Write an enzyme that holds these catalytic residues in place. Structure first.
Site, PDB file in Angstrom:
ATOM      1  N   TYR A   5      -0.287   7.317   1.171  1.00  0.00           N
ATOM      2  CA  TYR A   5      -0.007   6.397   2.307  1.00  0.00           C
ATOM      3  C   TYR A   5       1.493   6.071   2.422  1.00  0.00           C
ATOM      4  O   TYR A   5       1.896   5.613   3.509  1.00  0.00           O
ATOM      5  CB  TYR A   5      -0.949   5.194   2.215  1.00  0.00           C
ATOM      6  CG  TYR A   5      -2.375   5.525   2.590  1.00  0.00           C
ATOM      7  CD1 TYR A   5      -2.737   5.748   3.912  1.00  0.00           C
ATOM      8  CD2 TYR A   5      -3.367   5.639   1.626  1.00  0.00           C
ATOM      9  CE1 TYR A   5      -4.040   6.067   4.267  1.00  0.00           C
ATOM     10  CE2 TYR A   5      -4.675   5.947   1.966  1.00  0.00           C
ATOM     11  CZ  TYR A   5      -5.015   6.165   3.290  1.00  0.00           C
ATOM     12  OH  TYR A   5      -6.301   6.476   3.620  1.00  0.00           O
ATOM     13  N   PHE A  26     -10.676  -4.091   0.270  1.00  0.00           N
ATOM     14  CA  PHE A  26     -11.373  -3.682   1.520  1.00  0.00           C
ATOM     15  C   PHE A  26     -11.036  -2.210   1.789  1.00  0.00           C
ATOM     16  O   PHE A  26     -11.630  -1.567   2.650  1.00  0.00           O
ATOM     17  CB  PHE A  26     -11.011  -4.605   2.690  1.00  0.00           C
ATOM     18  CG  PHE A  26      -9.538  -4.634   3.005  1.00  0.00           C
ATOM     19  CD1 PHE A  26      -8.976  -3.683   3.843  1.00  0.00           C
ATOM     20  CD2 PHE A  26      -8.707  -5.581   2.428  1.00  0.00           C
ATOM     21  CE1 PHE A  26      -7.617  -3.689   4.106  1.00  0.00           C
ATOM     22  CE2 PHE A  26      -7.348  -5.590   2.699  1.00  0.00           C
ATOM     23  CZ  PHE A  26      -6.807  -4.645   3.539  1.00  0.00           C
TER      24      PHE A  26
END
Ligand SMILES: N=C(NCCCCCCNC(=N)NC(=N)Nc1ccc(Cl)cc1)NC(=N)Nc1ccc(Cl)cc1
Ligand SMILES: N=C(NCCCCCCNC(=N)NC(=N)Nc1ccc(Cl)cc1)NC(=N)Nc1ccc(Cl)cc1
Ligand SMILES: N=C(NCCCCCCNC(=N)NC(=N)Nc1ccc(Cl)cc1)NC(=N)Nc1ccc(Cl)cc1
Ligand SMILES: N=C(NCCCCCCNC(=N)NC(=N)Nc1ccc(Cl)cc1)NC(=N)Nc1ccc(Cl)cc1
Lengths: 390, 390, 390, 390
Positions: free
Chosen positions: A119, A390
């Site tokens: 990322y 999450f």
């Protein structure tokens, strides 16, 4: 392949890719609660016609230094079919969601990363550090200076209101804090129930100003795992740890906490709180540099200074920091600091020092004095923690 | 039992207690080199008549924030016979050496602790953090921003002069640095030779402004252990790590370094530099509070402030910090900060935040603003490292 | 003790011995499907009156070299009570079933052996080799020559018809292939469902001409186990493996396959497909030497030759092999080759070389030239695989 | 960097790179014996001026199918400094040595590979398979058919002449055999002596027509490791294994052998000879396709056939195989078989089937019949073994 917002009919295909991609997704009922946090147009799918790629964001509230709460796009449920690797599906999906997130007015996006090498290139910087402490509680004696020497053993499901209220105070006060809506409390307390051939029952240690949820390990019956300890005061934190050290049938207490957890200093032997694991927690992508740099608070101790910050392919800004506030305005004056967007995300919650990123040439400046000023200013008074994955 | 300075005849008894107490002491020849660093009256023994207790200090030079070098009493060779536990022999020996160290004019003493629960009560605070990074070097790719993309593979014994000169620059520049005299270089380069049924040969990676000594693990032939990496520049540090990642026959590189080692940030995947171990390194006892607080440099970014510091049973002082200098003078005005002596040692080299020790009630103050000022002021610009164990 | 065909009332006793003898038998419902494959008079029990011994055969169809399908007696459900060891119960039961199998006209019997030292003496030879490959898929890159560079991720239960049809093509084409009736597909797809405190959900990679059923390991969440990969073409096999190497959340893919699996050669590093386990798979007993030797195809490359084969206590035969066909007829001429019956079963599907069994003196001949001819003739063009355990 | 033949002065630099590159190189005395096998102009070094790269070949004699001995260039002592990765140093050194090896008239080169992903691209194919068998000798009973039921326990150094003579017979008779000169016997028998903090004493089991060198494992005192078992007859092989199974103080015997080792078949339980490890052994590069294809013997059982073989960037040849001899002559007729040079090396000693390399598309042909003929022809009557690592 076609990248489009998912239809109701596309959901079963998404649930299948999910079950195959994530060991934590059991079936459709696994999504019900998280899905209530996905806005209209919050999701993309790539079709081939079955779902071969998906990604979405959830509407979150993230606390940043100075107790400022930001609307935050929580990237989640990201998967590419094993059949469709190395076709730029992740690049395309992230580019579309980043468009929609920026246009919708989110100043930042955030995620938890399954690997550490993905990322960075999409502008996400590791912004919190998970720090596992394991205490051999059989040797743990509290220091004379330690507070206490107030907490109750309770069933989580019978004190929901009081966990909700303590967490709500905690998340507003601590950088890394996330708002936890009703449906995520429903899930949390459903996991607290013992699972057949699974996790054991969770118990709770409740203080007026703190709680700890813990569970005996499924296989190692001498290990207690603290899933979550939310302490609003130093007294609550110490009181809760006295109670956990009181689990006399256990050899070891483990918690995933933050590097500045004061626990080691509560003991006559600091070495008993052993670091057994460290990893990146929350990753941040700064969507809007000016909105993010202006929204957060800075150290009052550093004196007013001015510089020019360039984010590689993210704009150049006159940055003025003083009285713990920043003004960040467009400029074409010569840059004094350069860095990729990910580096700024890593700086933003105070977890990584500017001088450390500089020594690795991720942050570039020709003024060692400006470097010392950056370090001091971006430091957080309250140590950054991680709310929930999450 | 009698506590006295050891005679030449007491040395064989000391060598025997040593061999029985420490797995690193092989015999008298083990002491020859360290003994040259022990001053006249630097040693105590407890006799029963055989030696049942011993302790000594060595004359060292320790670098502290602001590149200030302090004469430092290095406590070492501390042992109590297994026959003589719980008779206060360690308390008596430490009290006598602390007397002689204080009278001799040493501002600080230092040690490496075999356990974490012993030396707190004698005023020693853990002051540096050992941080083991293990790199799965088979996945390690350098970030685009990483410097390089200069070092030579050499035999340590053929480049003594150049290791001596690089180390000498390193130790003067970095808080935690120790002067390394001739005889300790003699020992270091004698360990570099392969040992029959022991460690393998050490090799060296030499840069103009840095070196790394490394050795393949005795049993795990896919693990290279870096014993020592001294880098005077960010370029030297990066160049040296490119060379270590080039050890293509290895799976893993491990080093004991410091928490702010920039290595993780040199990689596309920060997670590859895994923290496998953390522990206290050097412990400090502040012998003279005013001399120690005045000798070291403080952060220029914090503005001039004044407070009153009490060390429990160690005096009370008017402390004025500004322009990165401290004046520390006697007073009977009301204390604003209190702490045990060990807490001050832990603060002194910048490894532990004041606010972290406060949350554990090891440092006490009623001004959260003074707490933020303490944190910022005692911070070290240059991250604290550990030189060598003694 | 009495050996008789089991009555309906004897079944509960058999189900109890089963549950106590096999870790894979849960209860009566475990037998329902396999029992439909047991013919009238296919089962024996030994009574004491409770069941202390049982054995049965199932009606199977086994593919042998030359794509010839043989009616095959599949020995299964064989157990002796722990109370009744060393009383020749297994010898008696095997002798009775072998009588009934031979009289019923089966040319061969087959089994999977729980130990390797039992069935040799009853004329069974290990005839296939299970070969576990474990791929560290994080290093796996396909060779430039590798095909591809077609498969879908699916739920097994929603594509039964297509698995049935691919398997049916596979089993008719490959030596070791077994017909898989409806009820065994019912069981296979019932195991594919996730089990509470048991195996995880199975997923499928579907190609027109191949499939792979795989499941993440119950405990090691970085290991994917391929239960079954049926590829009718080299393209299907390569396409399926590209998809399995695409399971990016896994470290390792393991499959139980055959020694000649081309997988290693699909990679730039053949060494990545590591052999982690080898064992005997299917065992064969040749019931009728002439019927078995005549039924199968032989290598066209070897030229016509004639010899006399003696099976120890199994007859002597004039064996003429040419144009990939054998004539095998009664004779009392001097034997040129001798071997026990088990050795012939081990030769029959091409898994074991005659010259290897000769070097161990399990096959005896005084013509090294006849030995080379045997090797070449009994070789299988299509490498022998293992269908499914029973 | 400069690639040149090493001078006497370049040797110390080579010895240093060696010690740093290989865990088996202790110092200069390690090279004395292997160096006698290096011809004038057999070595290259890359200088920077210190040695940063080296490679050499040794004059060897390799036995191939049909008991034909080939002059063979044994690549060895190959290293690139960790400072000099990804600069094409290995490509340059291999290209220079291949030039000199081809011009000197060697038909093949060979090596042992430290990794499996390196030498494929330089035309080397894995040509033998190392196969570790571990026997739980506490259950091992010899089959009734097993020969025996002749060997002496001896000190290796007192029977050099008899080991030399047995090995010499073995190496001339078995594909993979290497001539072992005096100096390599000197080294072998020097390793047989017990090492302080190292390997234990080696003992020998001597038969007229075979020997086994074995040693108790340094750490596991219930494991005997057979370093080497050379058996010229099936009787010698069986006799030697009866003696090894007689090491009653051991639980386990391990040997690195070949896939067709008859050992398993000598036992009532074949499963007791467990495959604990498999890997590529000797790698071959065919330097001259016609000279190599003509030199070796082929299976007499396959009938005369003709085809056209193309080696990618290695020529195209009319290949005629009959009466176990090949004629291989230049042609520009359409290729019927294509393959990279490495594939031919992997085929050459019979360890890899053509049909297996075809299924992976490493060997390409449109005639499945020609594929079956290739398989049968390149098969070796005598199973390929590995002599010794270099
Ligand atoms: N991997 C997941 N498993 C659920 C258990 C936590 N899911 C997840 N992290 N988030 C998610 C977000 C939105 C939706 Cl619609 C479904 C799942
Ligand atoms: N434990 C020791 N072993 C020596 C190897 C390091 N010694 C030590 N740390 N210091 C020491 C200091 C003075 C004397 Cl006189 C002897 C040993
Ligand atoms: N051990 C068994 N467990 C069933 C799961 C496979 N059974 C088995 N291999 N075969 C079987 C055959 C006939 C009958 Cl009537 C029952 C079981
Ligand atoms: N790695 C090696 N260690 C020696 C022990 C076997 N050497 C080696 N395989 N061969 C070698 C060949 C020539 C020379 Cl000049 C030196 C070593």
């Amino acid at each position: 392949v076609t990248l489009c917002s998912p239809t109701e009919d596309d959901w079963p295909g998404m649930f299948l890719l999910a079950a195959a991609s994530f060991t934590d997704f059991i079936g459709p009922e696994s999504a019900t609660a998280w899905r209530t946090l996905v806005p209209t147009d919050g999701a993309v799918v790539v079709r081939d016609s079955e779902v071969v790629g998906m990604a979405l964001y959830m509407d979150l509230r993230l606390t940043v230094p100075g107790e400022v709460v930001l609307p935050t796009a929580g990237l989640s449920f990201v998967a590419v079919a094993p059949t469709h690797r190395r076709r730029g599906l992740l690049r395309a999906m992230c580019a579309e969601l980043h468009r929609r997130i920026a246009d919708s007015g989110y100043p930042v996006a955030a995620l938890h990363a399954s690997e550490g090498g993905i990322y960075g290139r999409f502008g996400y910087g590791p912004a919190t550090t998970l720090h596992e402490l394991t205490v051999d509680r059989r040797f743990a004696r509290f220091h004379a200076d330690a507070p206490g020497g107030s907490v109750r053993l309770v069933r989580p499901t019978e004190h929901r209101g009081e966990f909700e209220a303590i967490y709500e105070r905690w998340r507003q006060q601590v950088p890394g804090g996330l708002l936890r809506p009703q449906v995520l409390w429903d899930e949390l307390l459903a996991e607290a129930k013992a699972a057949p051939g699974g996790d054991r029952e969770s118990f709770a240690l409740l203080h007026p100003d703190g709680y700890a949820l813990y569970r005996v390990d499924r296989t190692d019956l001498k290990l207690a795992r603290v899933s979550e300890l939310r302490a609003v005061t130093a007294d609550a934190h110490c009181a809760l740890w006295r109670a956990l050290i009181g689990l006399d049938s256990m050899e070891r207490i483990s918690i995933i906490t933050h590097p500045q957890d004061p626990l080691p200093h509560l003991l006559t032997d600091t070495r008993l709180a052993r670091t057994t694991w460290r990893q990146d927690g929350l990753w941040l992508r700064i969507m809007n540099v000016p909105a993010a740099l202006e929204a957060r608070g800075y150290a009052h101790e550093v004196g007013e200074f001015s510089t020019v910050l360039e984010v590689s392919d993210g704009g150049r800004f006159a940055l003025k920091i003083g009285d713990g506030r920043a003004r960040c305005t467009p400029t074409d004056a010569a840059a004094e600091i350069e860095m990729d967007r990910d580096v700024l995300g890593s700086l933003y919650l105070g977890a990584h020092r500017a001088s450390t990123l500089a020594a690795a040439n991720r942050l570039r400046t020709k003024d060692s004095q400006l470097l010392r000023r950056l370090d001091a200013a971006f430091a957080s008074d309250v140590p950054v923690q991680t709310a929930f994955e999450f």
